Design a protein around this ligand. Structure first.
Ligand SMILES: Cc1cc2nc3c(=O)[nH]c(=O)nc-3n(C[C@H](O)[C@H](O)[C@H](O)COP(=O)(O)O)c2cc1C
Ligand SMILES: Cc1cc2nc3c(=O)[nH]c(=O)nc-3n(C[C@H](O)[C@H](O)[C@H](O)COP(=O)(O)O)c2cc1C
Lengths: 176, 176
């Protein structure tokens, strides 16, 4: 709602150890309005190549059909979601992206923004499950700092998000 | 730095979503000098009952003989350590504590302080491994905030600490 919360999000984003993006849900094009350094490092793009545009261009011509259908549903309902996407860096190298989506601000059924956090798969040797759960932990800490996760709920939320990320890595590893 | 640096650590501690303690290694008894709200909640003690005392008050009898020997070695050598301890709340309720130890400040041969972060085991159902890795991820975020882990190293440090936590949980589950 408030500009004060927005400034807090910008500050948290700037210093975060995890990739973070913020998208404005009040516009149909759903443009990125914030994209932090770990995101740009992972994708290889500069800030100016991201802000004002939808994130989907990271997919190039890969349909990612079921994941996108799950995403559109979560965005419409204002619910959180974790899903694996096939993406490309600016230099056209492909990577697998475990994306965490969280509604931020506004009204519970209609958030003002969505936050996205990207965990790059395939870069943690044989400890992918632990690394993803680790990401979820660090992310839950940032959600608490921006006020999206209440303090009293952080420990339980961390457990749940970490377990959700590890489960998704297992399913993803079980196939292909 | 010095008192001023301490007060930033204090600020991180106060707001953290994970249990955190700080011990001054320059005082012979190695007393706890910072203990944050989630640590107090987990242990059932007030701040006043804790500060100025060695953290071994959480133990009883001569329990944890080998883990304590491992702890004394890590402390002496200035090494990180993860270890499981039988601890008790102020009401004597037992809990198992996955303790993360991290040197803070000073030089490799002589840290000024040690940080301890406590993850309570046995509260996560089937999610112990993921929940522990999640804690490691949150913790690594705080270690970067206080300057103990460099920003460009946070992602790698998170991966390895989460891997270590999960491995220790598996070991712990596969003993008994
Ligand atoms: C906050 C946020 C972050 C997103 N991050 C990514 C991303 O990193 N990679 C990606 O392929 N899609 C990402 N998306 C998804 C696309 O923006 C888009 O929502 C998705 O492709 C489904 O919509 P569509 O079927 O119209 O393309 C993100 C969406 C949101 C709201
Ligand atoms: C920063 C820090 C945090 C600690 N946290 C705990 C703890 O939560 N529970 C516990 O049983 N011991 C904890 N300890 C360990 C005890 O303080 C003590 O080092 C250990 O029992 C080994 O020494 P001892 O054999 O003389 O008791 C911590 C130590 C340090 C330095």
């Amino acid at each position: 709602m408030d500009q004060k919360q927005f400034e807090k999000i910008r500050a948290v984003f700037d210093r975060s150890g995890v990739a973070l993006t913020l998208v404005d849900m009040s516009l149909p094009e759903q443009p990125v309005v914030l994209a932090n350094p770990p995101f740009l490092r992972m994708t290889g793009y500069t800030e100016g190549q991201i802000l004002g545009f939808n994130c989907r261009f990271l997919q190039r011509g890969d349909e990612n059909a079921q994941a996108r259908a799950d995403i559109r549903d979560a965005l419409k309902l204002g619910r959180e979601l974790q899903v694996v996407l096939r993406n490309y860096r600016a230099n056209d190298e492909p990577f697998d992206n475990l994306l965490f989506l969280h509604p931020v601000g506004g009204r519970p059924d209609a958030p003002d923004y969505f936050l996205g956090s990207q965990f790059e798969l395939g870069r943690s040797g044989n400890s992918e499950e632990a690394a993803a759960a680790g990401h979820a932990g660090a992310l839950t800490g940032e959600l608490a700092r921006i006020g999206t996760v209440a303090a009293r709920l952080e420990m339980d939320s961390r457990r749940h998000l970490a377990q959700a990320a590890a489960a998704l890595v297992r399913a993803w590893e079980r196939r292909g």
